[PDB]
């Protein structure tokens, strides 16, 4: 069940335990949780931001709720205040929603960056490794996770009713198996140099190295991109969805105007840690893939 539909229509929805169970089981099994009726409304004063010309550089519009800092956009202080306010509201509403839906995770949910994406997807064109029309799990060369989960909340806020078109691929374990013969260890000392030179934020663990290989090699495997099991789904305007993007194979084909919120979660906070990419990779390679891993006696 690649997509599990939910009826919640409010950011302050209280959930029954049955729905909470359905959500955590689905999320950890690598399903997308879909909320067709959960819209994120904009203030009148924010409507001007539904315009791609606000993106100023190569990086997209982002906000760090921990530090209250806005990046990737230039303009008048009052306009940056309004834009920061929009993104902050998204961070607050998504964080509250996740705490209402996933009490099992308790305080282990750690918010990361909020993003606003006003550029139309279908007009994009970049390197194959960065081409997100190719199925992938998320792995960022400059930002290793140390094994922690990448959990993302998405809202389509297109004001013309346009959907956001995704494809959702096969389960992570099948993707890993498919690419296994192509995986290789890192060159000795290279990850240490990436750290020393500031190319990576922190040290790229072996896990991060392998997730990156999956990401990159999977995107270059043209036969796999064309023929692997995948379902195309249009997320309607006014909907929200939640996904572990490091586990769910996905691609983005078209759409415009999206809010996105990233959270991190340690593997030991999961209900079923054995389903995580870290544990699946450690089992497949029979080794510890993060050196800072906690030790269980
Ligand atoms: Cl429901
Ligand atoms: Cl190294
Ligand atoms: Co992605």
UniProtKB/TrEMBL annotation:
<feature type="binding site">
    <location>
        <position position="250"/>
    </location>
    <ligand>
        <name>Fe(3+)</name>
    </ligand>
</feature>
<feature type="binding site">
    <location>
        <position position="166"/>
    </location>
    <ligand>
        <name>2-oxoglutarate</name>
    </ligand>
</feature>
<feature type="binding site">
    <location>
        <position position="166"/>
    </location>
    <ligand>
        <name>succinate 1</name>
    </ligand>
</feature>
<dbReference type="InterPro" id="IPR021266">
    <property type="entry name" value="Kdo_hydroxlase"/>
</dbReference>
<dbReference type="Pfam" id="PF11004">
    <property type="entry name" value="Kdo_hydroxy"/>
</dbReference>
<feature type="binding site">
    <location>
        <position position="166"/>
    </location>
    <ligand>
        <name>succinate 2</name>
    </ligand>
</feature>
<protein>
    <recommendedName>
        <fullName>3-deoxy-D-manno-oct-2-ulosonic acid (Kdo) hydroxylase</fullName>
    </recommendedName>
</protein>
<feature type="binding site">
    <location>
        <position position="164"/>
    </location>
    <ligand>
        <name>succinate 2</name>
    </ligand>
</feature>
<feature type="binding site">
    <location>
        <position position="138"/>
    </location>
    <ligand>
        <name>Fe(3+)</name>
    </ligand>
</feature>
<feature type="binding site">
    <location>
        <position position="164"/>
    </location>
    <ligand>
        <name>2-oxoglutarate</name>
    </ligand>
</feature>
<feature type="binding site">
    <location>
        <position position="164"/>
    </location>
    <ligand>
        <name>succinate 1</name>
    </ligand>
</feature>
<feature type="binding site">
    <location>
        <position position="117"/>
    </location>
    <ligand>
        <name>succinate 1</name>
    </ligand>
</feature>
<feature type="binding site">
    <location>
        <position position="152"/>
    </location>
    <ligand>
        <name>2-oxoglutarate</name>
    </ligand>
</feature>
<feature type="binding site">
    <location>
        <position position="136"/>
    </location>
    <ligand>
        <name>Fe(3+)</name>
    </ligand>
</feature>
<dbReference type="GO" id="GO:0046872">
    <property type="term" value="F:metal ion binding"/>
</dbReference>
<keyword id="KW-0479">Metal-binding</keyword>
<feature type="binding site">
    <location>
        <position position="117"/>
    </location>
    <ligand>
        <name>2-oxoglutarate</name>
    </ligand>
</feature>
